[PDB]
Amino acid sequence: MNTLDFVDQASLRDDIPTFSPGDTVNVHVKVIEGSKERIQVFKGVVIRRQGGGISETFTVRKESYGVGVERTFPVHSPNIDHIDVLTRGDVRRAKLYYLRELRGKKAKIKEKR
Amino acid sequence: PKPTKGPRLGGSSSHQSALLANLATSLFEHGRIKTTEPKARALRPYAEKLITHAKKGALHNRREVMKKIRDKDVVHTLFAEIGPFYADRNGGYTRIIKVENRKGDNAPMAVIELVREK
Amino acid sequence: MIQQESRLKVADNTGAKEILCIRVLGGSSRRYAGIGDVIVATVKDAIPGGNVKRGDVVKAVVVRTVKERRRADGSYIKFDENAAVIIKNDNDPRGTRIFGPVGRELREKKFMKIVSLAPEVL
Amino acid sequence: AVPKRRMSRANTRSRRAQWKAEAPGLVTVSVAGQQRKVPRRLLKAARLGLVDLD
Amino acid sequence: ARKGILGTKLGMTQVFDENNKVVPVTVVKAGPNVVTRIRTTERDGYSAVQLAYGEISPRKVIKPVAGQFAAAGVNPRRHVAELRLDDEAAVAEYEVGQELTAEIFSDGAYVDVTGTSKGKGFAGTMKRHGFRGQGAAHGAQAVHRRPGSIGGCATPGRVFKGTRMSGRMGNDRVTTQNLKVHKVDAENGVLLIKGAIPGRNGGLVVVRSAIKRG
RNA sequence: AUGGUUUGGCACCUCGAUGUCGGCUCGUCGCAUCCUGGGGCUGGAGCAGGUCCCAAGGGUUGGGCUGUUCGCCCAUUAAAGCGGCACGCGAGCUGGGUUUAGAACGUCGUGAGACAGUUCGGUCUCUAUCCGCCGCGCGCGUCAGAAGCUUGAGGAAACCUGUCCCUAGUACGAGAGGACCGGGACGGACGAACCUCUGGUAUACCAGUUGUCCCACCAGGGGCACGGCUGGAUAGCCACGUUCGGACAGGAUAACCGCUGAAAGCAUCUAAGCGGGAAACCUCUUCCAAGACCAGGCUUCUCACCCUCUAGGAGGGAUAAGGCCCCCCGCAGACCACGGGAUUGAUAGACCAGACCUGGAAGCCUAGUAAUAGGUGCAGGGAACUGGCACUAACCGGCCGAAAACUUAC
């Protein structure tokens, strides 16, 4: 029942799509560039998801220009306007930390068919 | 269940696991045993969860019990009388009674037994 | 999280391939340099035909770190390597080309030229 | 380290008086009719006939 | 003047502000407080207000405490604590039986929370005082965590009192100053205070208007 | 003229033992002040310095070389202070140097050998009695016995600082350059609390897997091999994480700037007085604190019953309010103490549900020659967290624990 649940649920954000580690998503992230708005899209693989309710976080990993990048977002962050799921991955793990040592051909994820 | 806060019972984790398994086997085989009070205190939740497995007695629960008990006659009795006997009791399958101290080392002794009231 | 005697890949085209951190500028007994911090470094590996040479004491700015770094909105950014860009006193690159992504922290630290030159800013 | 001096009798006795035993508290119980004293910690066991009374 | 209330530390959570920044907030159950006694200079020599908080069965109270509560005119509460004011002008706004609730504070106010620090038991100098240990290798013999030197040699001849050594740690009253009140939820009697407040969950705390930033 | 911080001189101190340098760990003090603070004169235009006063609150970096101190150098910094204390600190550590025994080089000696010359190697013992100090209890006292909440005499802690932005490219200045005073933001180092996030850990969690033995065999599991090894991993504890702090204001002052003016018909910041004036001092912020023996205050509860000697006091017993032990426990803890609960009960365990961790159980069916895959099925398993639930254990119980009066005043 998680005693702080009544405080938590007021700020809980709906409309989050269902997704699991291993999926490929694009996170639409609004940014500030000299006091103006725009959405920068981060497309990558969801490698982990640490459940906490409002304190939920997920991590998305992408390879960009030969350097791997990891970004961790709060699931209910208002700085994320919208999350879109592209493909569903087939993995045997809850956390894909082994992908930090794989590049290119070996770093691909099976698609849930 | 909850692990022990301090040092383990037999002097190591593996010895404590074997000790708990043997004590549970003895309890289910005889119905009551006498041992040191901390040993019975540690034994209560372990044996109660084994009895819970035996209560909803299916093949899966049977294999869950066998991965701890290792003695097959005790498993059979646990799944044929002990489980059915506690069918309509929700928890509290055992009780602990404190008895007189040991003489050689003044160790506090206790008796743990299965409840038989209903 | 870069400190003294740490080694960084050079994300520029000055001919330097690798630099060693000598000092983290920005206060006495300062310990670590994250993204956007300026360090004094010596060049350890260099391209044979580049303008810089081994043993040159230069100034660089950290643009990527392995240790994840928190942001104001509760998000985190993390890279697969520690990288730096060799600069001059006016906070401008000594090279003409930045390789790989950089963090957003270079904006609030007023590294506008590096941000503009970067292939992508995250 | 070793004691530099021999203890006086007063100091030795004052420290030694702290090594003592406390008397356990006893409560009455009726087992097989006759009343007898037992520690409260063993009251239930005595009532169940699990403690030997000489 | 300075407001105050008795409450309970519920736990820590997360919220986001209007600029989308995340705020780590401690949730305090600033429950209803009842004024039980007024300390006045003409009688006690100092001006203070005494508040009661918490719920207890009346059979759990002893006769003296029950008598004090009956003389005041209210039913007993678990916790009783005094708030020290400055002068009778600040003591005139409280009367016995008056009920204090969380809405005395406002959004964005600055508060000072007082609680009992968590217990750490017997702690070494490395933990209790942040001593740097000695080396872990290069010949160091069984001194990896010991404090080292204790004093001088002849002119000291003794150990100065106040010397920092190992001992019991924690369990002491601690005040955190200039904490910001992010939100005052009046429905649940809950205060959202940005930061960390002393003690364990379910502990008793006193929230007061800040003495510096107010 | 000071000092015993340098080498000295004396040999009063120890040869029935006073560890010899640096380094590490941990200090404490002085001010002859390195930075920050306040001033004065400038051969001070401003900037910036010179230089001199007052000021000890805090601060005062990391490396290369050498056994080093010392020193030189490299990057910084507001700054990289000088000294006392057995040139502080080996029953706290080291053993690189010096200072045994082995061996070698140069030199000296016929030789055994030698060298405030070099070189390589070379046992650092101890269960803390007393004082001291850091914590924690027991006893008694505080003129009846108790219980809540407190005042504080008196102490302890903390005290650092940078960059940038507005005022302002003005004052000054041939221009260049460059402000005073005052508000704001963001930092570094240090400290405290804390665990929402990030990260670490994880010896009763989940999964994979190697070798071997066992469960009669298959299937499914278990014991051992560092938890066998790997992949994760909630609680708790933590920092690399989060939040907060150093204040503002007042008082008396230092150097100094002054006002009103005598002795000394003027003058003189002075002998009478009155003001300003600093990170130093007192308050102010945080914490401890009535064993503060002047042992405090405000309240509330009990506020009574016998027996003995010779009734002078005493002794004994039984009680009240209340407390302790036993009992169930704790994120409280070495023990003790502290805190909560004790059937008029959710204290712990179990059980039920949720949260979370793992990641798709068994059995069966299907596909495949098989390895194996798919369905049943966000499956199964499970600790700490949350809520229910008296099912189990907190028990037909013991020990403590309340008043001489008198004097004077009203």
Tokens 């407040």 identify what position? E197
Q: Tell me if B75 sits within 8 A of B66, measured CB to CB.
A: yes
Q: Which two tokens stand for residue B109?
A: 């002794």
The neighbouring-strand residues paired with E180 are E110
Q: Which residue in the set E16, E22, E27 is minimally distant from A4, CB to CB? A: E27
Instruction: Output the CA torsion sign for E58, E62, E66, E68.
Output: negative
Q: Which two tokens stand for residue E97?
A: 């039986």
Residue E97, exposed/middle/buried by CB under 10 A (0-12, 13-18, 19+)?
A: exposed
In single-letter form, the type of residue at position E211 comes to I
Residue A20: which domain range? 1-113
How far is it, in rounded angstroms, from Cα E75 to Cα E61? 10
Q: List the domain boundaries for chain E.
A: 1-214
The CA–CA distances, whole Å, from E15 to A10, C73, E12 equal 10, 10, 10
How far is it, in rounded angstroms, from Cα E23 to Cα C73? 9
CB within 8 Å of C95: residues ≥ 6 apart:
C12, C13, C14, C85, C86
How far is it, in rounded angstroms, from Cα E177 to Cα E111? 7
Tally the domains of chain A.
1
Label residue E10 left, alpha or beta by phi (over 0 means left) and psi (-120 to 50 means alpha).
alpha
Measured in Å, how far apart are chain D's first and last C-alpha atoms? 50
Instruction: Output the CA torsion sign for E42, E43, E44, E50.
Output: negative
- The SS3 call for residue A38 is strand
How far is it, in rounded angstroms, from Cα A74 to Cα A80? 9
Q: What is the 3-state secondary structure (H, E, C) of D20-54?
A: CCCCCCEEEEEECCEEEEEEHHHHHHHHCCCCCCC
Residue B80: which domain range? 1-118
Tokens 């960084």 identify what position? C8
How far is it, in rounded angstroms, from Cα B109 to Cα A54? 49
CB contact under 8 Å between C73 and E22, yes or no, is yes
Q: List the domain boundaries for chain C.
A: 1-122
**Angle between helix B59-69 and helix B37-55 axes, rounded to 10 deg:** 160
How far is it, in rounded angstroms, from Cα C103 to Cα C62? 9
Q: Best of E13, E17, E19, E22 to disrupt the C interface by mutation (most C CBs within 10 Å)?
A: E22
Tokens 């290792």 identify what position? B70
Total number of residues shown for chain A: 113
Distance, in angstroms, between E12 CA and closest chain C CA?
A: 16
How far is it, in rounded angstroms, from Cα B44 to Cα B40? 6
Task: List the CATH number of the domain containing B76.
Answer: 3.90.1030.10
Q: Tell me if E205 sits within 8 A of E195, measured CB to CB.
A: no
How many angstroms is the resolution? 2.7
Order across the sheet with E48-53: list the strands.
E79-84, E48-53, E33-39, E99-100
Nearest to B100 by CA among D42, D32, D53: D42
How far is it, in rounded angstroms, from Cα E136 to Cα E56? 54
Helix (H) or strand (E) holding C84: strand C83-87
Q: Which two tokens stand for residue C121?
A: 């800013």
Check whether residue E153 has its CB closer than 7 Å to nucleic acid strand F: yes
Tally the domains of chain B.
1
Q: Tell me if E48 sits within 8 A of E85, measured CB to CB.
A: yes
CA atoms within 13 A on the CB side of E11: 9
- The SS3 call for residue B81 is helix
**Chain A interface, Cβ < 8 Å to C:** 29, 31, 33, 40, 42, 59, 64-74, 77, 79, 100
CATH number among 2.60.120.380, 2.40.30.40, 2.40.150.20, 3.40.228.10, domain C1-122: 2.40.150.20
How far is it, in rounded angstroms, from Cα B54 to Cα B74? 11
How far is it, in rounded angstroms, from Cα B67 to Cα B60? 11
How far is it, in rounded angstroms, from Cα E168 to Cα E122? 4
